[PDB]
Design a protein around this nucleic acid. Structure first.
Lengths: 545, 403
RNA sequence: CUAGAUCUAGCAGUGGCGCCCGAACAGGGACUUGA
C-alpha cells in the first residue's frame, strides 16, 4: 500500500529483555483483542526464536467498559534512535470563513500502516503467546511522526488534484471545508473517501458531519463563529491548592476569548506554599479579583475566523500592576481572540518595557498563527516613546502604530537630567555591612555640614546602599545631585522603574516622584574621590574590621 | 565527479536546532522558489528518518527585489571547524587591506554545479515551517554543495584555483580572497579601471560556461578611532569626577595611566556646580594622559586559532560604537557609524571589516532582547553569510567610551 | 523496575500552573604568595 520508512537502532544496542504479574479477569480480555488483531490481518505471531520481551499493562479508562490493552516501550524509547518531531497545535482563530465545513475521523488508523519487516522483530508481545506488531504500535516514539508523514505523502495527490480545497489535518481529525454548496461538497468528500480507501482507510456516511459544532480539544467550532468548550467555576468559599491550580488553569485557558482576566493576585498565593493540602485565605484583593472574573464570565461570547483579504488590528487595555491585556479584532467589537502578559523579567522594570515585551509577544503570536504583524493602537504618545527609546541603551523598535486616548494611560512619573543644576545640593553617600552581623550603617552629607547617620539590620551591601540613599532622600529637598560608589543603584535608577517587588525600591520611587527634579552620578571607591572616602571611613566603624 | 567524504567532529552529533516562526509573505516565496529548486534536481523530499534540522528563512537583497534563500550552518560550522581548518585550509593574506578599494562579489550560485557525498547529505537537513501548524514542514536535503557554508568552498578551491588562474596571470597586482559564497578582490588602481577589471573577471568566470550572474568598499580610510577627551578651561567638580572615573576605567585598559595630580583637587569636598581652575600639575597630568591615549596600543597581536569577540553599544541619534577583542581589555580596533536597520547595517559593516582584515567571523554581543532581534533581523538582511551572536546587558562604563 | 498494608497497585505522548538542580556572564567577599 504505502511506502514504509526503514528504522534502525542506536549505536551498539539491541532489543530490551525484561521479564510483571497480571490478573486473571483481564486474560480473556487480552486474548479477544489479540485474536481480533491477528485474524484481521494486522499482527503476526512468531515467537519461537526471537528472544525479546515487551510486557503488557492493561487499565480501565473513562467510559468504563473493561480493561483495555496497552504496551510498554519505556525501556525501548531510549534504546530507539532519536527521531524527528514536528507536531510540537493550531488555533481556532487561525482558520478561514468557510460555509461547507466537515470533519473525517478514522478508527484504528494507527494500525492502518504496516512496518518494515527488519524492525518487527523488536515487538515480542509475550503474555504463553507472542504477537509481533507489523503495524505502528502505541507508545512507540516515532508513531505520531510516521503517522503524519504517511498521511501527508498519501494525501499529496489529492492536494494536487484539488488545490482550491483546504485541509487542516491533525493526529486523527481531518478538518476540511470550503465556501461551496453542499452538493459538490459531498461529491468531493466522496471522492476523498474513495481516494483514501484506495490505501485501506475507513470513513462512514453518518459520522459527526452535520452533528457539529465540534469538540476540538476543548474548543467549539461553529459555522461563522467559535469559542472554547463551555467553562464553569465553583461557588464555594474555601480553596485548596489543588482547586487553586485547577481554577487557574481553567481561567487561563478561557481567557483567550474572555477579556479582562486577572491571575496575578490569585497566582501570588502559590508563593511558598508547596504542599497538596494546605488551605490559604483569599485576601480581599484576590476575593474581589475572582468576583470580577466571575461577573465577567456571566455572559457568553464567541470569536470569528480570520479573513486573509482583510487586515487585523490590535489593542491594549492597561489596568495597573503589570496585569496587561490585549485583543485582536478586524472590526469594532469583533474581538478575534485575547491573551495576557504579566511575566516579570526581573523585579526591576517599568511600564514601557512591559509594553514592549507584550507587543513583541503579540507580534510573535500573530506571526506563528496568522503569518504577519498587525497594526497596534497603544495608549501612549509618539513623543514620549521617541524620547524613551532614544535616551535608552537598547533598540526597542515596533511596527507602525498610533495613539489611543482611553485611560489609564502610559507615562513616566519622573525623568533624569544628564547635567547638574545650580541651587541644588550634593550628598556623598555610601552603605555597607559585614557578612556575619549585617548591621550596616549609612547616612548623608552636605556642604553646610548637615549630616546624619542611621543603622541597618540584616541587609546586604546592595540593600545597604539602597537604604542609605533612601535616608538621604527622605531629608533632602526637591532637587539634588547625588553620587554613589556601586553600579547597583545607578543601574536601578537610570532604568526608571515605576514598579518592582521589593517594597524598598517601591518606597524609593514613591518618595522620588514627588521631587520636581533629581540628578545622579557614580564614582568608584579605592581611590579617595571627594566625600566618598570620607563617608566610607566615617561608616567604617565596626563594619569591615 | 569525486564527492570526497566528510563527517562532523569525531563522535559528535549532527545539528538538531529548531526553527523560529516565519511569515506567510515570505513562506509563499520560499515555497515558490523551492518548487523550481526541486524541479532542477537539487534536493528531494524525505521523512523523519533523521532528527537533524537547520533554521531557514528568506531575505530581500539589494540590487533586486526577488526573495533569495539561505541556510544557517552556525552549529554545523562550530562542529566541523577542524575539517576545513586542517584538511582543506587556505592562507590569509594581509596586504589586501592596504589597497585603495575593493568590491565584494557573490559566486554562491556556481556551487550547485557539483554534487556532494551521499553519506554527508544526512547532515544537510533543512525543514521549511508551516503557518498555524496546517501541514508538517516539507523536509528536504541538499544533494549538492549548499550555500552559507565554508566546507563547500573549502573543497571547491581545487577547481576555483584553475578557474581563477587565467585572470590573475594577466593582472598580478590584483589580489583575490575567498571566504564563503561571497568572493573578494584586491584593487589598487583607478576606480573606473577597477570596475572594468571586475567586468573582465565576470566574463572570465563565464568563459567555461560556469555562469555566475555592499556594492563597493573602501578599507584604506578605516583607522583606529583615538579615544578623545574634553579640552576646555572650566572644570566643575561634576566634570572633574566624570574625568576621574573615565581615567580610572581606562587605567585597567591602558597600563600607563595616572590620576595622581588629578586626585589632589578631589581631596577638597565641594558642590558639583562650582568652578575650580586647576594648577599646572593638573594640566601637566592632563597633557600626559592626552599624549598617552592618542598613541595606539603597543603589545597586542592576533591569534588565528583563538576565538573572536566584538561588543557593540548605542549612544543616540544613530551614534553607534563598536570594539573587537579576544581577551578582556585587549582592544584591536575601534570606529564609529552614523533602529534594527542601523544595527543590522553596522554588524554587516563590522563583519566585512573583520573579514577583510582578519578573515574570520567574530561573536558579537548585541544589547537587545532575544526574541525581538531573532524575529526582526531577517527582514533587513542583505548578505548571504550569518555569524554567531549573543546578548548582554550594557553597564554604564562602556557608554563613557564616547559621547 | 517503583509505591501502599507476603497481598494489592503503579502506563506512556501532547498544552498549561507551580517547584528543584546544573552550565555560562555580571556584581560582591575571603585563603596562600610576592612587591
Amino acid at each position: 500500500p504505502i511506502e514504509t520508512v526503514p528504522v534502525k537502532l542506536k549505536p551498539g544496542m539491541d532489543g530490551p529483555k525484561v521479564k510483571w504479574p497480571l490478573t486473571e479477569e483481564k486474560i480473556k480480555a487480552l486474548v479477544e483483542i489479540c485474536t481480533e488483531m491477528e485474524k484481521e490481518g494486522k499482527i503476526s505471531k512468531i515467537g519461537p526464536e526471537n528472544p525479546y520481551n515487551t510486557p503488557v499493562f492493561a487499565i480501565k479508562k473513562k467510559d468504563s467498559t473493561k480493561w483495555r490493552k496497552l504496551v510498554d516501550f519505556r525501556e525501548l524509547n531510549k534504546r530507539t534512535q532519536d527521531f524527528w518531531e514536528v507536531q510540537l497545535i493550531p488555533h481556532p482563530a487561525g482558520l478561514k470563513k468557510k460555509k461547507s465545513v466537515t470533519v473525517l475521523d478514522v478508527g484504528d488508523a494507527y494500525f492502518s500502516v504496516p512496518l518494515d519487516e527488519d524492525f518487527r522483530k523488536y515487538t515480542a508481545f509475550t503474555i504463553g503467546i507472542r504477537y509481533q506488531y507489523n503495524v505502528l504500535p502505541q507508545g512507540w516514539k516515532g508513531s505520531p511522526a510516521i503517522f503524519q508523514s504517511s498521511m501527508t505523502k498519501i494525501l499529496e495527490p489529492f492536494k494536487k488534484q484539488n488545490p482550491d480545497i483546504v485541509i487542516y489535518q491533525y493526529m486523527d481529525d481531518l478538518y476540511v471545508g470550503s465556501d461551496l454548496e453542499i452538493g459538490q461538497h459531498r461529491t468531493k468528500i466522496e471522492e476523498l473517501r474513495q481516494h483514501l480507501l484506495r490505501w485501506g482507510l475507513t470513513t462512514p456516511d453518518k459520522k459527526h458531519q452535520k452533528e457539529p459544532p465540534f469538540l476540538w480539544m476543548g474548543y467549539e467550532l461553529h459555522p461563522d463563529k467559535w469559542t472554547v468548550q463551555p467553562i464553569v467555576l465553583p461557588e464555594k468559599d474555601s480553596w485548596t491548592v489543588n482547586d487553586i491550580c485547577k481554577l487557574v488553569g481553567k481561567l487561563n485557558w478561557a481567557s483567550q476569548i474572555y477579556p479582562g482576566i486577572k491571575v496575578r493576585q490569585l497566582s501570588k498565593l502559590l508563593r511558598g506554599t508547596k504542599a497538596l493540602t494546605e488551605v490559604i485565605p483569599l485576601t480581599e484583593e484576590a476575593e474581589l479579583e475572582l468576583a470580577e472574573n466571575r461577573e465577567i464570565l456571566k455572559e457568553p461570547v464567541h470569536g470569528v475566523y480570520y479573513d486573509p483579504s482583510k487586515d487585523l488590528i490590535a489593542e491594549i487595555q492597561k489596568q495597573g500592576q503589570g496585569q496587561w491585556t490585549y485583543q485582536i479584532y478586524q472590526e469594532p467589537f469583533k474581538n478575534l481572540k485575547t491573551g495576557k502578559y504579566a511575566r516579570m523579567r526581573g523585579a526591576h522594570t517599568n511600564d514601557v518595557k512591559q509594553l514592549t515585551e507584550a507587543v513583541q509577544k503579540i507580534t510573535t503570536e500573530s506571526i506563528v498563527i496568522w503569518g504577519k504583524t498587525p497594526k497596534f493602537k497603544l495608549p501612549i504618545q509618539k513623543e514620549t516613546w521617541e524620547t524613551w527609546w532614544t535616551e535608552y541603551w537598547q533598540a526597542t523598535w515596533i511596527p507602525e502604530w498610533e495613539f489611543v486616548n482611553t485611560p489609564p494611560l502610559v507615562k513616566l512619573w519622573y525623568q533624569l537630567e544628564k547635567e547638574p543644576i545650580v541651587g541644588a545640593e550634593t550628598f556623598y553617600v555610601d552603605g555597607a555591612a559585614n557578612r556575619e552581623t549585617k548591621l550596616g550603617k549609612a547616612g548623608y552629607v552636605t556642604n553646610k555640614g548637615r549630616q546624619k547617620v542611621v543603622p541597618l539590620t540584616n541587609t546586604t551591601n546592595q540593600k545597604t546602599q539602597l537604604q542609605a540613599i533612601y535616608l538621604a532622600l527622605q531629608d533632602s529637598g526637591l532637587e539634588v545631585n547625588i553620587v554613589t560608589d556601586s553600579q547597583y543603584a545607578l543601574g536601578i535608577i537610570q532604568a526608571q522603574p515605576d514598579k518592582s517587588e521589593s517594597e524598598l525600591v517601591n518606597q524609593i520611587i514613591e518618595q522620588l516622584i514627588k521631587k520636581e527634579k533629581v540628578y545622579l552620578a557614580w564614582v568608584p571607591a579605592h581611590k579617595g574621590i571627594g566625600g566618598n572616602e570620607q563617608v566610607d571611613k566615617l561608616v567604617s566603624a565596626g563594619i569591615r574590621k | 565527479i569525486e564527492t570526497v567524504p566528510v563527517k562532523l567532529k569525531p563522535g559528535m552529533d549532527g545539528p538538531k536546532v529548531k526553527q523560529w516562526p516565519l511569515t506567510e509573505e515570505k513562506i509563499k516565496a520560499l515555497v515558490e522558489i523551492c518548487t523550481e529548486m526541486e524541479k532542477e534536481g537539487k534536493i528531494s523530499k524525505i521523512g523523519p528518518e533523521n532528527p537533524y534540522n537547520t533554521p531557514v528563512f528568506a531575505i530581500k537583497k539589494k540590487d533586486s527585489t526577488k526573495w533569495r534563500k539561505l541556510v544557517d550552518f552556525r552549529e554545523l560550522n562550530k562542529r566541523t571547524q577542524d575539517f576545513w581548518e586542517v584538511q582543506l585550509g587556505i592562507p590569509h593574506p594581509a596586504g589586501l587591506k592596504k589597497k585603495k578599494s575593493v568590491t565584494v562579489l557573490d559566486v554562491g550560485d556556481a556551487y550547485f554545479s557539483v554534487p556532494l557525498d551521499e553519506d554527508f547529505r544526512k547532515y544537510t537537513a533543512f525543514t521549511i515551517p508551516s503557518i498555524n501548524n496546517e501541514t508538517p514542514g516539507i523536509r528536504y536535503q541538499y544533494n549538492v554543495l549548499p550555500q552559507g557554508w565554508k566546507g563547500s568552498p573549502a573543497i571547491f578551491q581545487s577547481s576555483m584555483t584553475k578557474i581563477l588562474e587565467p585572470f590573475k596571470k594577466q593582472n598580478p597586482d590584483i589580489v583575490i580572497y575567498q571566504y564563503m559564497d561571497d568572493l573578494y578582490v584586491g584593487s589598487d588602481l583607478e576606480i573606473g579601471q577597477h570596475r572594468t577589471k571586475i567586468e573582465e573577471l565576470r566574463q572570465h568566470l563565464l568563459r567555461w560556461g560556469l555562469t555566475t550572474p555592499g556594492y563597493e568598499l573602501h578599507p584604506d580610510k578605516w583607522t583606529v578611532q583615538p579615544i578623545v577627551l574634553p579640552e576646555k578651561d572650566s572644570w566643575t567638580v561634576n566634570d572633574i569626577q566624570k574625568l576621574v572615573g573615565k581615567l580610572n576605567w581606562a587605567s585597567q585598559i591602558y597600563p600607563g595611566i595616572k590620576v595622581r595630580q588629578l586626585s589632589k583637587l578631589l581631596r577638597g569636598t565641594k558642590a558639583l556646580t562650582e568652578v575650580i581652575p586647576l594648577t599646572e600639575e593638573a594640566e601637566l597630568e592632563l597633557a600626559e594622559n592626552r599624549e598617552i591615549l592618542k598613541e595606539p596600543v603597543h603589545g597586542v597581536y592576533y591569534d588565528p586559532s583563538k576565538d573572536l569577540i566584538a561588543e557593540i553599544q548605542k549612544q543616540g541619534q544613530g551614534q553607534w560604537t563598536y570594539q573587537i577583542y579576544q581577551e578582556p581589555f585587549k582592544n584591536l580596533k575601534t570606529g564609529k557609524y552614523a533602529d534594527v536597520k542601523q544595527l543590522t547595517e553596522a554588524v554587516q559593516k563590522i563583519t566585512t571589516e573583520s573579514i577583510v582584515i582578519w578573515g574570520k567571523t567574530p561573536k558579537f554581543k548585541l544589547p537587545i532582547q532575544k526574541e525581538t532581534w531573532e524575529t526582526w533581523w531577517t527582514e533587513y538582511w542583505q548578505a548571504t553569510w550569518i555569524p554567531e551572536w549573543e546578548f548582554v546587558n550594557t553597564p554604564p562604563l562602556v557608554k563613557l567610551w564616547y559621547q
